Design a protein around this ligand. Structure first.
Ligand code: ATP
Ligand code: ATP
Lengths: 788, 788
DNA sequence: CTATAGGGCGAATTGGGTACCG
DNA sequence: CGGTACCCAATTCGCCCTATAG
């Protein structure tokens, strides 16, 4: 029974209706007492997801008001439930003091919790980076921006066309994606989690030019080389405004912008990245991954940087030569380095929470702790003789004065909430300890009087205690509550007792609660000053974290290299991969049986290898080993081979395993070049066998006559093995399974040629078919090959 | 630690050591209170599997004794755990009262719980038959015996050689298998669950001749035509003795022996069975099965008989013509038949438990209930005019006197255990009701006194109750346990009260528990008499169950026929299958879009059909449709086609898919004849395309030149399409997927010829490869078919 | 005696109670 | 003033646990 004109509503709902009207397409948490109350349609959705009982707010006005509510202290739990569902939610809070506000207390939206801007640790998987991005389409191309709000890392790109958008979208995997109403290609956008449609006026170039310059404080974006790419800047502006709108505050940690160049990275198509199983397998699990066997790192920061480095393999040689020399020098001390680096903690996400002024003292404990670990690191690092190691040593800095300030201004092990205090250490603010002296004077007076009044009145059941609602009392049991002096003022009546107050206790109760509130407000006001003291050096702290986890990677890649006997690979100028004693990493790390290793050669000349041989012969594992070495070479780490020599590579194509097969193949033969490594796993195997033949036969010839890429074709066809006689670049290689007696063995060893008579003609003799039938095959096997 | 000679042990362990010595190769459950205590090596194995804590019993003997124990009431749970692992276990009990043995109470093995003889319903999957078998090898041949202890159905066979042993072993799937120490072929035996080695003297012919005759009560086994097959009889004898030994009692339900003739059944090889997904899919589940679609049977017995019928398709025409006419006549009344037949219950397993004297009253409820449903069945069946229906009506019988006895001697809804009584109804034994009168006098006296003593003492918290260990008490709360009269004798010191006894209550508690034990022992003694009353007619009851579930099948098939439009198929004398509007049963029951139906013809002449065409085009499902029709023709049911004409069939060979492929192919081409239906599916799958070609090409030619069987070859190879020009009997059939514009359709329609241009050359244009690459395929697709 | 197995001893807690509140 | 935020308290349920005598 609801009429809802502006006037008809009560002053509290009039205030909410305007606040909800600002953000009407998203849910709101509205502070009231100790509960965030939801109303009408919002109360309905909340009841479905949060599974909280849908109730109705009392209709004093007249109109029905569907209502739901959740406790303020447990908000984060429900926020997590909503964030998994990709539900955007606004948080609004009482800004003014309700006593001084005659009308409804001044409420304002404090933050907008979106899947992109979740900076709260509870909502962030520790070894996964959370990202926020928007996307724009012009007739020529697309403007894709990204911001790691949890780090301040801000990126941008102008990818050429639709297929590269998908590669970028999977590689980023943005838990939240903003876009514009005019976006034409709606296949790519639909199905993405936390999908947001936006107004067109937000993607204006002029607004972006000014906004980006204002946030950085630099007059020209020329300082970061982004000026010459306006399409991407537009998305940045909306993202920066969206981030600003969602956090309602300045973002000074976001101090820079960078252009992710296609030229400066290996372009892996989305599909190739599903087959490599870099961090996530085909099944969607985190088992049998390159990451798991390459990852034994101490800090989550280090794992993320590793996962980023894997997704973004770098192409410049200088950066690789710098890293290898460092890892080689660290190898000896790894034993002493790994333990100290573990107590560093999540500095990157800590600094960002500090930047947003939303860091909590348990984070400040990890910060001072990391500050304590730095000097011993500097000591162990000083003895090391290599140029980048001393550079990394300088970059961590000292921050010793800040550590002293923290040790002076925080206790050793702090609580999670500032609301109850006991955070700041004793001797920093003499006034703090003056107010805490009255708090510690609670212990003695209460018991001292509890014995004093017990001695005076002569009542042995006399107990002094504190009730949150009734303040400080004296509890005389019902058996003695008639011998209580006239002085003892009745305060509360109980089941088995009676509670009394005197002006002396009331005077103590007044001074203690006031001194408490004085102590706590001072603690909060100083807790703000801690941010004010440390904010100046935030740029240097952000440089410190950018080196610490940049060291964690270099120490693990040394521990793994020493443990798995990996060797550093030299970079050469010509595209071409030469491997000696090659061992696939993931298999040789989950197999009781030893991995028989195999050398591989790829060159301007050894570009194409046809792989044949029996099923269950691991025809597949031989190729995955090359691609993963080629990837590891360009992350700058060592390789599980005696020696690897790598040539520069622009793109890695792969289709492990019809409609889906031709799409990714068509994609490769249009976008592959001379610097491309292609890895066909099965090809021309759709049906018929005279149809798939006319597909793959041509596919390889085009991959080795024009694209001139490198390929490790795995083909069941025995007719694609005549390519070397017809085409230059191709070379047959075969994985042979041996047969002694009635047992087949899996050698997974790689050699030259392939076998006309198959192990099948011999397998036919094992559990033998009638002798005429096996003879009849021999007659036909001879006939097929001979006529050809 | 001490000497372990016979004397050194304590009297209890001396008794156990001799008992264990009788059965030392199997575990024992030794009755020692609820916990059947297990010792030494047994305690070790128990701790590993039952996951019960391995402890050590005190060394009274002087040597440390390891020990485990499990409660008697929860034995069945641990028995199930052991049965799944195939672990045989003996159950021993204190049979003689403590007086029978001066030392430890007489203890005898009551039963040997083996995976074969599990008659307990809890250990039997309701819709799966449990079996028990032995196998001994002789120079002449193998003797394979089987006993369905849960039914009394006892079979025997003398299979020729090894390959048929495996087919029989899988078809039976004996949860347990017994064999002889001299057994040569140990590949077949190893890997089977609950594997048992036995002494040689058990497989003597003379002992078997006498033992089988003694059990049947027939002077000559000539009464069942088994005399002329001694090898099989030997295994029977051991099995009969093993069954006898395992149950320690007579087996009068096992009243007959039968020789399973290869001639009188369709011989399905083990492998074929796993592919047609008859009861169990490739994945091992019970979903998407012929069973799942053909099984809405109203009693599990009916599903088992269906599954048996499926697993043993019958060959004699008379039995089929009998069944079809019956199902056709039943079709009209199916609506009225299905509900009444549901209340029948598991009569077959019930009668066997009754026979073993191990039936439980919950089973007797289903028996009397089925007896009540018979007259209304006889009424509905009387109006039906067909010869076998009236014959089936006679076979169920009346058993009206037994129903009257059961209605007089069992209550409506009985409990599971006889241990607590309340089973037998009131008016049968006047002495029972005399003892039950004291039991029903428990309700009034307890509450009458509870108020009487409450009125006398003046204590309002006075409660009269019964604790199993402390007997009958009076509970006075701790607040009033000091006002309790001196008469009230303290019994139990409760945590919040005190429990008292007086001689009046004790006198009542004595007379009630004695009268209980008198009532209960009488209930058990009469519960024996129930078996003694029904045992004479057990042969007729076993004939009744053999018709009831044999009716459930004939009504379920009629229902599923009316619903899915199944039509009766005529039998012809020449082997050959003609199908019109053929509809595969499972897919048209799990597929949203319409299953398109398709006709098929198989004859002395149309014996071979090569199936080609696109992948995801049902190259495979159309062949599975024919085999399942051919099977369902020889179970005697209707078929999901307008009309089916079937010719007699001896064997259904089916390979659906290297080492494993050639074994079952070899097996077919040795054991296939003129009456064989073969379904090579994806054959010639040699990983080398050239290799597999030489294999299947010859396989088909041999299947159509000498074996002269019927085949539905599903082949990806497009070279096997030239057979009709080379070989008579072969005929190409193709399932075409259409391509109009940029959409591919799944017609699932069967026509003549094959598609030379494949959907792939068109699919290449969709999500198009470079125009040169698609052109290059055309060039090659033309080249491959033209050269041929 | 030496084991388990029903009995002893807490122990969390959830559906009401109880004001209450701008 | 119509729910609503805060407040229990006597349990049913979970976890020990401690007996003595053929
Ligand atoms: N170097 C090696 N040494 C020992 N075992 C190996 C080696 N490489 C692989 N294997 C094992 O042998 C198995 C071969 O089976 P797999 O299915 O991978 O064969 P495949 O020929 O790659 O199959 P497909 O032809 O379907 O791609 C692997 O799964 C792995 O367990
Ligand atoms: N009669 C039908 N009409 C329409 N769709 C069908 C029909 N039968 C099956 N389908 C659907 O089309 C799919 C075709 O795949 P299916 O596995 O049957 O192909 P197949 O050629 O038998 O495969 P394979 O050659 O690998 O054995 C089925 O999975 C099902 O979803």
């Amino acid at each position: 029974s609801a009429i809802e004109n502006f006037d008809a509503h009560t002053p509290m709902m009039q205030q909410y209706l305007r606040l909800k009207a600002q953000h009407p397409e998203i849910l709101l948490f509205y502070r009231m007492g100790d509960f965030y109350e939801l109303f009408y349609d919002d109360a309905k959705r909340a009841s479905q997801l949060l599974d909280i009982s849908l109730t109705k707010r009392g209709a004093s006005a007249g109109e029905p008001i569907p209502m739901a509510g959740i406790p303020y202290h447990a908000v984060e739990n429900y926020l997590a439930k909503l964030v998994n569902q990709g539900e955007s939610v606004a948080i609004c809070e009482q800004i003014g003091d309700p006593a001084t506000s005659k009308g409804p207390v001044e409420r304002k939206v404090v933050r907008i919790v979106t899947p992109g801007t979740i900076s709260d640790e509870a909502l962030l998987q520790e070894r996964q980076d959370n990202l926020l991005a928007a996307i724009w389409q012009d007739s020529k191309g697309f403007g894709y921006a990204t911001l790691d709000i949890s780090s301040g890392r801000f990126r941008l790109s102008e990818p050429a066309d639709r297929e590269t958008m998908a590669a970028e979208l999977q590689r980023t995997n943005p838990a939240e994606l903003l876009y514009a109403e005019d976006f034409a290609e709606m296949s790519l956008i639909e199905g993405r989690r936390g999908l947001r449609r936006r107004p067109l006026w937000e993607f204006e170039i002029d607004t972006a030019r000014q906004q980006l310059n204002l946030q950085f404080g630099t007059r020209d974006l020329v300082g970061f080389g982004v000026e010459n790419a306006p399409r991407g800047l537009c998305a940045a502006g909306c993202l920066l405004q969206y981030a600003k709108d969602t956090q309602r505050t300045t973002l000074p940690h976001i101090r820079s912008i960078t252009m992710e160049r296609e030229q400066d990275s290996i372009i892996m198509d989305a599909a190739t990245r599903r087959n490599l199983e870099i961090t996530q397998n085909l099944a969607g699990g985190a088992e049998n991954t390159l990451a798991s066997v390459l990852d034994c790192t101490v800090t989550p920061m280090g794992s993320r940087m590793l996962k980023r480095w894997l997704h973004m393999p770098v192409r410049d040689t200088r950066v690789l030569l710098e890293r290898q020399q460092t890892i080689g020098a660290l190898q000896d001390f790894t034993a002493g380095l790994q333990p100290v680096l573990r107590q560093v903690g999540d500095l990157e996400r800590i600094l960002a929470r500090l930047a947003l002024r939303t860091a909590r003292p348990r984070d400040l404990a990890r910060m001072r702790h990391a500050f304590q670990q730095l000097p011993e690191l500097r000591a162990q690092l000083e003895t090391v003789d290599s140029a980048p190691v001393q550079a990394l040593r300088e970059k961590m800095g000292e921050f010793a004065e800040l550590r002293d300030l923290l040790e002076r201004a925080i206790i050793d092990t702090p609580p999670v909430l500032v609301r109850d205090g006991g955070v700041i250490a004793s001797g920093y603010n003499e006034e703090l300890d003056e107010w805490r002296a009255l708090a510690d004077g609670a212990t003695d007076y209460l018991e001292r009087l509890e014995v004093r009044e017990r001695e005076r009145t002569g009542l042995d059941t006399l107990k002094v205690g504190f009730n949150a609602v009734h303040g400080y009392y004296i509890q005389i049991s019902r058996g003695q509550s008639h011998l209580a002096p006239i002085n003892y003022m009745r305060r509360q009546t109980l089941k088995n007792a009676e509670r009394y107050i005197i002006p002396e206790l009331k005077e103590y109760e007044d001074k203690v609660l006031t001194s408490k509130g004085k102590a706590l407000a001072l603690e909060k006001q100083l807790y703000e000053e801690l941010f004010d003291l440390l904010l100046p050096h935030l740029e240097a702290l952000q440089q410190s974290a950018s080196a610490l986890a940049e060291l964690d990677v270099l120490v693990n890649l040394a521990e793994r290299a020493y443990t798995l006997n990996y060797t550093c690979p030299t970079f050469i100028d010509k595209p071409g991969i030469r491997i000696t004693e090659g061992r696939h990493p993931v298999v040789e790390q989950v197999l009781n049986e030893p991995f028989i290793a195999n050398p591989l050669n790829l060159s301007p000349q050894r570009r194409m290898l046809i792989i044949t041989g029996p099923n269950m012969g691991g025809k597949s594992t031989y190729m995955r080993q090359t691609a993963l070495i080629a990837l590891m070479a360009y992350i700058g780490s060592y390789v599980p081979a005696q020696k690897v020599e790598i040539g520069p590579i622009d793109r890695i194509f792969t289709r492990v395993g019809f409609m889906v097969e031709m799409t990714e193949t068509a994609n490769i033969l249009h976008n592959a070049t001379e610097y491309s490594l292609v890895l066909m796993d099965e090809i021309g195997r759709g049906t018929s066998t005279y149809d798939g033949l006319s597909l793959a036969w041509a596919c390889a010839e085009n991959l080795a006559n024009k694209i001139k890429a490198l390929t490790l074709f795995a083909t069941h066809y025995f007719e694609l093995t005549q390519l070397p006689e017809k085409m230059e670049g191709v070379a047959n290689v075969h994985l042979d399974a041996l047969e002694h007696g009635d047992t087949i063995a899996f050698m997974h060893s790689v050699q030259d040629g392939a076998a006309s008579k198959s192990y099948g003609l011999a397998v036919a003799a094992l559990a033998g078919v009638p002798k005429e039938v096996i003879k009849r095959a021999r007659q036909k096997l001879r006939e097929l090959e001979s006529i050809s």
